Amino acid sequence: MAHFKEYQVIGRRLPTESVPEPKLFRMRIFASNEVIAKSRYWYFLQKLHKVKKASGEIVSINQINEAHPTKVKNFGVWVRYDSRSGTHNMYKEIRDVSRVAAVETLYQDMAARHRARFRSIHILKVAEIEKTADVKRQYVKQFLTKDLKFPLPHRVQKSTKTFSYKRPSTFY
Amino acid sequence: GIDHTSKQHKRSGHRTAPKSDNVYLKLLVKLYTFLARRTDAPFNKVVLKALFLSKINRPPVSVSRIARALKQEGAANKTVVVVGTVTDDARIFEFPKTTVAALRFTAGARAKIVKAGGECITLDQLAVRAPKGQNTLILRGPRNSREAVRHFGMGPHKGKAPRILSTGRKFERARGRRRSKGFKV
Amino acid sequence: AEQVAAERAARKAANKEKRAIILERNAAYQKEYETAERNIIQAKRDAKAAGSYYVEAQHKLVFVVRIKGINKIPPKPRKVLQLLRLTRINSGTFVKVTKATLELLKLIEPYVAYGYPSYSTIRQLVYKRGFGKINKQRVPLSDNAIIEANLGKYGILSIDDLIHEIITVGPHFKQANNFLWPFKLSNPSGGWGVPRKFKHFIQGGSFGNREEFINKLVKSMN
Amino acid sequence: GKSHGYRSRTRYMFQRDFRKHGAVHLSTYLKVYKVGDIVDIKANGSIQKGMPHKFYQGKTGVVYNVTKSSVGVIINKMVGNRYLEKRLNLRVEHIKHSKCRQEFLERVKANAAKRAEAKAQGVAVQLKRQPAQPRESRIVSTEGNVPQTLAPVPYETFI
Amino acid sequence: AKSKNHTAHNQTRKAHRNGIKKPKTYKYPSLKGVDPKFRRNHKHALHGTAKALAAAKK
Amino acid sequence: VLKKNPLKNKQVLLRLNPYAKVFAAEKLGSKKAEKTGTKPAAVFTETLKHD
RNA sequence: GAAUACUGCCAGCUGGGACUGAGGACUGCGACGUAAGUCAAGGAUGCUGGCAUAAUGGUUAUAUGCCGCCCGUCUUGAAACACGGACCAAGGAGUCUAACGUCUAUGCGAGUGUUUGGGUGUAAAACCCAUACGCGUAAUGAAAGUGAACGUAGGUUGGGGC
RNA sequence: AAAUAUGUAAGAAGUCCUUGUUACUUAAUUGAACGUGGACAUUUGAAUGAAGAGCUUUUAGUGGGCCAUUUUUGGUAAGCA
Ligand SMILES: [K+]
Ligand SMILES: [Mg+2]
Ligand SMILES: [Mg+2]
Ligand SMILES: [Mg+2]
Ligand SMILES: [Mg+2]
Ligand SMILES: [Mg+2]
Ligand SMILES: [Mg+2]
Ligand SMILES: [Mg+2]
Ligand SMILES: [Mg+2]
Ligand SMILES: [Mg+2]
Ligand SMILES: [Mg+2]
Ligand SMILES: [Mg+2]
Structure with a gap:
């Protein structure tokens, strides 16, 4: 489910005689498949509007691919979540x-x-x-220094066999 | 597992053979099995099913019942078929000349039918002359006229006959049967 | 010359013209499916060109698989599963989509996995596991003459005609669908794909509406 | 000890409606019931004669007998493992016509009208009702209706 | 030693084992409970209409 | 006496469905589609890329 | 302007492994062939090898891996720290009768029932039988009593069969 | 003033058009109920299913219950009631 795709989902209320042509509400959803994307769209229209799947329609669902999937980007992600005893907003940043x-x-x-x-x-x-300098979290900002380079000490090498004859080393 | 909507391994509830050991009856059943299979006439199927019936499900058919059935229009020349016994009836004083095919004729019934100019016939001769049940008329006797049926469904306000040995005053004609003694049924 | 060849040649000539009828029907059904698919694709492309959106027709057909055993079922879902003819686990039936049937599926949702079958799924299902209900008995199809003997009044002469009467919900859908015995499917060959079946498909489980993924599930199940 | 009288547990359903007490309006008494009519039972609490038992509140039945001020209503009552025919003598205060059977009778007339027209022109009039069908395809124009909506909203205290 | 007083547990399963059946309505229901004046009329109306039918048919 | 599956046993697959011979002889299962140069509209592309 | 990923389709081709071979003349649906025929088309054949006996197999004792609490009973619940049971043989518990209900079989049937008794006998058998009597063919009422066709033994609605 | 649960209806034992019965009903040749004759066609008036559908007789054991989710009373509570 974590193999996330991003979908745009455009839906609307079902047209009636009083109001033909409703307003086509559009959202960006992260979900593994289209079924979960549509379900998440209706869940959010349920909470944010007086719209439910029974009295609504999906007019489009499209997957959005990354414009430059091989370019390293710093992403600020605002989320709300429910802890065990409340609801909280956080800001995090992922370099990806x-x-x-x-x-x-x-x-x-x-x-x-x-x-x-x-x-x-x-x-x-x-x-x-x-x-840069709009980055605020040190754990991401530390990876933006010029001439970044670091060793990887203590290499542990996976062994194909039960027994070894060499007393392995962790050089790298 | 299966969610069984119906009871499993349920017998049909219908007789597929006579319960008796009469070999002549079993020969009749064999003949009408062959006829009910190789002919499409529903007469042979109805006769075959009637050949399996018990005694209470084969009430006797009187000659007066046959004469009344022959008073029907278009049925004067028909062949009356009784899968069972034709009993006699002295209540009548005329009998039409006709052909009756039955399992058994009482001595009085056979004498009355033959004296009227007709003939008594067995079901095998019936099969020979009317293989498809041509112009036959199947008659059945009264099944609810049985004395046991009077007591079926006994209960308050059902109007049924109690199961009783001695009849008269002092035998269940008191409290529960009249308002002056408690209540009435 | 005991009059065997005359009726044998009459029977072979009748069989040949019946097969010619089935062949010309199947050709016209193939062109009908081909244009039905190409028109929808080209309609979406035209709508994108004009800046509008093409909402496709809601799916008229679902395939429903009972994925739950027969123990500890509440009476109302138990009755609905009996009415949809899913009496054992991994049984399957086709359902026409109406408000009545959609409320039936919305009521047995925790015990079934259903979705919108494709032509390939329906064709392979009917060819491989299709048995007819003939004189209350479960008869393997295996022949066009059996389907013509039981559905010939409805104009369904072959297995392809039956498949079309299922994929497009025709006038005689109810009779053709009830003539089909409930498909007895095996467990999926690669498993269900989830640690636990009895959550909704949206919640990482298996039951509910998984609309287009029912094809992959049913293919692994047969 | 326990109490199971005739009108027990009827405190709220033999109320009159709020601001609806007093005398009954004459349209109750000007309604005509024939044998075979289908009626709904709802006791008027201000008329204590011909009052149905609490069980039959909300039950719908068929009129079998018509008397001076009352009708005989047949109701099927589930007793044990079967339904028993129950015959009630109710004043017309507690009785109203089934509106569903009124639309059924109107639909019968409409069905006859449709078949009557189809017998002359337009055969295969297809009388039967059908359930709500799935929607067909459509083209939703964007011109003047450009889609525009945002994401979920942050939590706020609001206290 | 007190026992259980009452429960309707299993009663619906027993009731539905042989089903709950409707009472099998007939054409021409019984005239029991119908108004006696109507019944007295209806006997004569039926007698007269059978007389007219038999007189016409002969 | 024995159910022979189609989708294998091409004899049975030809006993049913006589069109399967034409389907194979013409490779209708791998039909090449006509190239179409119908572009999406700018309002559609901009809406898709819109945040 | 291409490629590829992803998802999907093919009545595309093909390699390896496993279990099964039910039926037992023919009939059918087919396919390839101008036909004549052929076939993988309503269920396995062909070829080859060894042994022909304790070899396979059965039984039995044992060993090994895994599993397996003491039966009977009362009970919501028994392996129970509930009761009976040390062991074995033999015996050991829904019978017959009077009257009766439903169902079934048989005989005869508006009747039916010989066997109280008589006759007879190859002698507790078998065979034969008069008059009665029981039940039934009439009910209802406390009783005195009275006592069943207006009609093709009625009309209506279904109703097998003809 | 919900949700869940709950009654009924969705036709042939029907509908419509004439004109027949009556001792009931109307001021009335008005109704009521039951009819004769005539018309309605195979979508005979939603869906799905139906494993055969109805019906009857007769008889066994049982009439100590207990557990779980949810609702819920007494009780501080209870492997309590
Ligand atoms: K108690
Ligand atoms: Mg595996
Ligand atoms: Mg009073
Ligand atoms: Mg162990
Ligand atoms: Mg024990
Ligand atoms: Mg213990
Ligand atoms: Mg003890
Ligand atoms: Mg001891
Ligand atoms: Mg002892
Ligand atoms: Mg012994
Ligand atoms: Mg003994
Ligand atoms: Mg006890």
Whole structure:
């Protein structure tokens, strides 16, 4: 389910005689498949408007691919989530090459640090930070220093066999 | 597992053979099995099913009942078929000349039918001369006229006969049967 | 010359003209499906060109698989599963989409997986697991003459005619669908794909409406 | 001890409606019931004669007998494992016609009219009602209706 | 030693085992409870219309 | 006496569906579609890329 | 302007492995062939090898892996820290009768029932039988009593069969 | 003033048009109920299913219950009632 795609979902109220041509509400949804994307669209129209799936219609669902999937981007992600004893807004930043994988990173991050399931999270916004110094979190800003380079000490090498004859080393 | 909507391994509830050991009846059943299979006439199927019936489901058919059935228009020349016994009836004083095919004729019934100019016939001769049940008329006797049926469904206000050995005053004609003694049924 | 060849040649000539009828029907059904698919694709392209949106027709047909066993079912869903003819696990039936049937599926949702079958799924299902209900017995189709003997009054002469009367919900859909015995499917060959079946498909489970993914599920199940 | 009288537990359903007490309006008494009419039982609490038992509040039945001021209504009552025929003698205060059977009778007339026209022109008039069908295709124009909507909203205290 | 007082548990399952059946309405229902003046009239109306039918048919 | 599945046993697949011979002889299962140069509209593209 | 990913389709081709071979003349649907025929088309054949006996197989004892609480009973619940049971043989518990209900079989049937008794006998059998009597063919009422066709033994609605 | 649960209807035992019965009803040749004759066609008037559908007789055991989700009373509570 975490292999997230981003869909645009455009829906509307069913046309009636008083109001033909309704207003075509459009949302950006992160979900694994189109069924979950449509369900999430109706869930949000249910909460934000007086619209439900019975008295509504989906006029379009389209997948949005990344414009430049092999370009490294800094993404600020505003979310609200329900903790065990309240509701909270947070801002986080993920350095990643695509919005979908940045959302994957945030869902894993939010599950790891706050024990917050996909059930409990609303993605308020995912935005590219255009330039450095608008980055605010040190854990991302530390990766933006010039001539970035670092070793990887203590290499642990996976062994194909039960027994080894060489007393392995961790050089790298 | 299966969610069974109906009871499993349920017998049809219908007789497929006579309950008796009469070999002549079993020969008749064999003949009308062959006829009910190789002929499409529903007469042979109805006769075959009637050949399986018990005694209470084969009430006797009187000659007066046959004469009344022959008073029907278009039925003067028909062959009356009784899968059972034709009993006698002295209540009548004229009998039409006709052909009756039955399992059994009482001595009085056979004498009355033959004296009227007609003939008594068995179901096998019926099969021989009317293989498809041509111009036959199947008659059945009264099934609810049985004395046991009077007591079926006994209960308050049902108007049925109690199961009783001695009849008269002092035998269940008191409290529960009249308003002056408690209540009435 | 005991008069065997005359009726044998009459029967072969009748069989040949019946097969010519089935062949010309199947050709016209193939062109009908081909244009039905190409028109929808070209309609979406035209709507994109004009800046509008083409909302497709809502799906007229679903395929429903009972994915739950027979123990501990409340009476109302138990009755609806009996009415949809899903009496054992991994049984399947086709359903025409109406408000009445959609409320039936909305009422047995935790016990079934349903969705919108494709032509390939319906064709392979009917060819491989299609049995007819003939004189209350479950008869393998295996022949066009059986389907013509039981559905010939409705103009359904072959298995392809039956498949078309299912994929397009025709006038005689109810008779053709009830003539089909409930499909007895096997467990999916690659599993269900989820740790736990008895959540909704949206919630990472298996039951509910998974509309277009029912094709992959049913293909693995047969 | 327990109490199970005739009008027990009828405190609210034999109320009159709020600001609807007093005398009954004459259209109750000008309604004509024939044998075979289908009627709904709802007791008027201000008339204590011919009053149905609490069980039959809301039941719908068929009129079998018509008397001076009352009708005989047949109701099927579930007793044990079967339905028992129950015969009620109710004053017309507690009785109204079934409006559903009124639209059924009107639909019968409309069906006859449709078949009558189709017998002359336009055969295959297809009388039967059909359930709500799935929608057909359509083209939703965007011109003047450009889609525009935002995302979910942040949490706020509002206290 | 007190026991259980009452429960309707299993009663609906028992009731539905042999189904709950409608009372099998007939054409020409019984005239029991119908107004006696109507019944007295209807006997004579039926007698007269059968007389007219038999007189016409002969 | 024995149910022989189609989709294999081309003899049975030809006993049913005589059109399967024409379908194979013409490769209708791999039909090449006509190239169409119908572009999407700018309002559609801009709406899709809109935040 | 292409490629590819992803998803989907093919009545596209093909390699390896496993279990099964039910039926037992023919009939059918087919397919390839101008036909004549042929076939993978309503269920396995062909070829080859070894042994022809404890070899396979059965039984039995044992070992090994995994599983397996003591039966009977009362009970919501028994392996129970509930009761009966040390072991074995033999015996050991829904019978017959009077009257009766439903169902079934048989005989005869507006009747039916010989067997109280008589006759007879190859002698507790078998065979034969008069008059009665029981039940039934009439009900209802406390009783005195009275006591069943207006009609093709009625009309209406269904109704098998003809 | 919900949700859930709950009654009824969705036709042939029907509808319409004439004119027949009556001791009931009307001021009335008005109705009521039941009819004769005539017309309505195969979508005989929503969906899905129906495993055969109805009906009858007769008889066994049972008439200590207990558990779980949800609703819920007494009780501080209870593997309580
Ligand atoms: K008690
Ligand atoms: Mg595997
Ligand atoms: Mg009073
Ligand atoms: Mg163990
Ligand atoms: Mg024990
Ligand atoms: Mg213990
Ligand atoms: Mg003890
Ligand atoms: Mg001891
Ligand atoms: Mg002892
Ligand atoms: Mg012994
Ligand atoms: Mg003994
Ligand atoms: Mg007890």
